[PDB]
């Protein structure tokens, strides 16, 4: 609270940077220590620091991640919270703002000067509020203190007219009545730095690596952990990551983009049954995705009723996803290649007729087209249901309880769905 | 005063796709719709060190100690099959049209002055020098970059596609048409008038380009090589990665685009090269030297300001180059 | 302090030879030893541990890219 | 907002270089705002000439192939770039990493207006496909399907059905046509109640943390993974304001001087990829614009879904 | 002043393919278009210790402990079938021509001086010593690297390929034409004139080279060997599609073995044309830069300050420019 | 935490008997129980779930190979 302790702390920091400069000077002649103790030791340091202030800027939304020859505006603003629930960004951080710095990197001494926590809070937080401890410690006269503080508080404001460069992005948005808004967006560096710290904690943290080793030992640890697959890396500073920002020195580039991918992003090529052994292998013809799906179906055996409600709805969603993947597999297998009508034989499980929908009609117009339109081949659901009955564990206890009746009920419901969608194939 | 716009931007006309490559035998290239693709596979290469010494380590000890430690690589190659001597490269081309209007402009005065200037150019002389040279670069297979340099016979087929079918078929011999002369042919003029009608109108014009190159059995073809940085760790790292769209080698789209814009023969230096690509400050990255420097008054920017602001219409070759930049597209603008 | 390092000078960023072994105080000392022991022009240095883990590499004409 | 009287289907579109950087936090499929802007540009270019109002899009994404590459010895991925031209001196330009991707989407755009009875449905679908053939979707050229097996034509389903059986029949005939894909919808109330549950567990919880929790895969002690319903992804859900709105001729170096500018920032919501027959109503699943410009909040979503 | 360029990139001339190896019986070589391929298969080996010891493993206890438990491996072997005694190695060779023009260059005047130097080279003497020795290395089957060392009789069939057919066929005995003498023959001079016409740009030249080597029934052939990342898998072979093959650059290294002009003894024979002319199997570098006879000083004295070297040294320099590479400093 | 494991001690890596059942806290505990309950010299342990999925095995004289 006392201004004398703050003044001693300021002199100690300026002297600390002086002895750091004298140590990193490696000097033996030319008398540079006199210019060092004249320019970097006196209270003219704060005068030249107030000179260096106008190059700096505290920002949460920098422009420089967009194409680096872009001289536009840069903001320090936290938006209001949206009234609509759910979605969020930039209005969640209350205390955890990192407050990124843009400007001349050689003038970073002013930021490390103001960034200390000397009494209980930030020094810029002291100079922003009118206090008796403030406006006097870096002073012998009041007017130069007013000038130094009027410099030091202006780093958080945008300097100049608002502008975005030609290489900055700006996007028309249709208003509901008519007309548009221009919507120039920025790169949220506080957001990327906060998500970067959380991802680095979840991937390289010791509290997660302990549980990661405890899974390999298969022991019982108090908390779980997470993995975050399919991250991508984007780097902004090409070879010089210092020129973009200050928080681009903590993370050297390394945007760490989360994946937002469709489920069919791995190309699964198509395999049609040709011979007899191909007719037994490719009758179900099953991807690793359904293996992963029915493996989690196998883990739904034990149940207490107050949890077994939610386990039953999750079972309904799981068998729903099973018949959806079966239908999509039939769709891409039937509309991808002519391989269902590639070579005949004796065994193809040719009662199927769903994996060969245009394969029996587009070439044979009278032979099999009447054999498909009049038959309406939909008996495949029963063999598919018998394929599903291997997914339940054939235990006498789960057979004897009512879980068998509940399970057969939900299979009959989703099987009816699969049947009625398989039915209308001729239209 | 008609100051320049602070934001200028043109959409890329003459838009090509990724040029897939396939393989097969010559003299059944008419039924080349089911030819299998050329696949990119790995092979492992090694060799000694060939480049120049840094003049302070010229001693025989570390020289012989260096040639007893060869470098080890894993490179990608794309070879033709051992029973096929033809490389079939096929891509689709859209000529969009509306080649003068900017996609973004601050000043409306700059906008209608520039639109008036472009209209003045096109009713003075339409796109018939530019479309002639674009039809040349589609005619001689300059988009086959290194796949051209030793071929026995290259034949290029361009079919203009209507709403669903082939509206007009061309067929060229790309070795009879040289890589440095823009002459006059009948089919070349018909193709150039089709590209002219595309560039002037509002609808798009779609072209399918096929290029057969008779190299030889099992020889090497050269697709685009992917620019990757942050490569990883030397036990598993690959040294040279080829482009592959769907398990099939391919030339990048912008490489085909950079081949089609090789029409610029009006740069002030001598044409020991012949034509180069169209760029503002026209630079050849194989040559490493930027022709049309701003110290001479022959770059794109100053020519456009003299053509629109102060109305000094330059020579007809230089406004051919300016309109070629406008068909090329770009993002121009000061602060 | 006297840690052992492996210095390979290879053709591109991903090529493997055997490289000579030094013993240096710091990694900034090994960056200074390896730049002296570069025989050829268009090669790329790299600094290793004895097990194979990377420390840094440097293409010719550029500066030291530092991964681990 | 408005129920579409018709539901026009653009077929499988081949797009060769889409912007795979959807947001500063997500890579992958391009933003829904790209598709809504695409249909608003379609409305701007032919929706006036045919007396219609194209509104809402159904995203399908049959095939997705990103131009990425996993470096050796890392778990994460990087992007394959392009070679820029040199500067005027011959030095190389500083590279800006832009992700590219090859898409295959089908667009279900909802059309309503007085132009339905003026023209035949096949003619207006043919004209809107010829206008779509010369555009770009998220930065990528729309490949116009030459010399293949057969071009996929359009189908404008009139949503006003004579019967509910006829409506369900024609809906099923459309769902068979766009089946191998995966429709993308926005699920924000699910994110809200997941925020509620996670704040029941531990207080002061952000819903950025809830979006992160629904994105990742996470193991639990007895080891088993924790189940997620469906394929949940994070998506950019529109923009939020930073600066107050400026006058149209006020900001330096704008895109236009007739339109007001406002510095904004992203909003990350939650999307989901479902199979298209799961919704059982194709009149929804269309992405609209919700501006309410007085508080910022320029955002897109899909109402009428659940 | 005319310093050297900062980039120089020469395309490779004499492009070979991947030399496929199949197998069959001698004395039906004329119908060897349907010969089945040699298949790379896996077999297990167990090896005792055979290397030198590092003077601490010379304890008999540690030696017997290492000998009791030897290492297991799974090598890749490639053998002829039990009823076949002929290895057919087939590849195609494409001679390009335009041997002086670089594919990339910074300086222009350096490129004109280099083009004039190469043009006066071709005007003084055509590609006649180089094409003769290249046709020699096609004549004796040097591209059969270790498959040649014990063969009973090797035969090389070179067909010149026109549009889609043969135009002029050759047939040699690869063991009569030695590995170290560049002599004269009628068919060798005809093939040399064809390669000379290809290299000078006076026509398109595509050769198909087939080499039959009579090894023996079920013996071991040697295709190229890949790099590797109990079943340690210590040896991996190259194969294009279930069929063993020699790499393209190995065939290219065998064709570039013409350099008989290196300053040391010629008791070794011809070596590969390389700057700082080096051999991996001997670990020695002839044409060191401490003497004035490697590629770089010879080219920079030929093209900058016009010290035209001896006829064989400019033969070697134009052979380097035929070989390709990246030259030029930073 | 008290998970059940099957411990088979068989002749080589691929031979099947019935093995006794234990109940252990962690897999590193079951590796320590099974090394105590090895009757013979030249045998190979293996740890299973109750359904048949593998966890780890260990030849005599070597250390624990861990697949699942």
UniProtKB/Swiss-Prot annotation, chain A:
Gene deletion effect: Mutants lose phage DMS3 infection-dependent inhibition of biofilm formation while there is normal biofilm formation in the absence of phage infection. Decreased production of crRNA in the presence or absence of phage. Disruption of the entire Y.pestis-subtype CRISPR region disrupts crRNA production but does not alter phage resistance (possibly OLNs PA14_33350 to PA14_33310, and the flanking CRISPR loci), indicating this CRISPR is not involved in phage resistance.
Domain of life according to the entry: Bacteria
Presence of keyword Chloroplast: no
Keywords on record: Antiviral defense
Chain intervals for the UniProt region annotation (Disordered): 69-90
Biological process, per Gene Ontology: defense response to virus
Ribosomal protein recorded as keyword: no
InterPro entries documented for this protein: CRISPR-assoc_prot_Csy1
Comment field (misc): In this bacteria, Y.pestis-subtype CRISPRs do not confer resistance to phage DMS3 or MP22, but instead are required for DMS3 infection-dependent inhibition of biofilm formation and possibly motility.
Family affiliation: Belongs to the CRISPR-associated Csy1 family.
Subunit comment: Interacts directly with Csy2; part of the Csy ribonucleoprotein complex with a probable stoichiometry of Csy1(1),Csy2(1),Csy3(6),Cas6/Csy4(1)-crRNA(1). A Csy3(6),Cas6/Csy4(1)-crRNA(1) subcomplex is also formed.
NCBIfam families found in the cross-reference section: cas_Csy1
Task performed by this protein: CRISPR (clustered regularly interspaced short palindromic repeat) is an adaptive immune system that provides protection against mobile genetic elements (viruses, transposable elements and conjugative plasmids). CRISPR clusters contain sequences complementary to antecedent mobile elements and target invading nucleic acids. CRISPR clusters are transcribed and processed into CRISPR RNA (crRNA). Cas3 and Cascade participate in CRISPR interference, the third stage of CRISPR immunity (Potential). Involved in crRNA production or stability.
Name listed for the protein in its UniProt record: CRISPR-associated protein Csy1
Protein species of origin: Pseudomonas aeruginosa (strain UCBPP-PA14)
Species classification: Bacteria, Pseudomonadati, Pseudomonadota, Gammaproteobacteria, Pseudomonadales
Gene: csy1
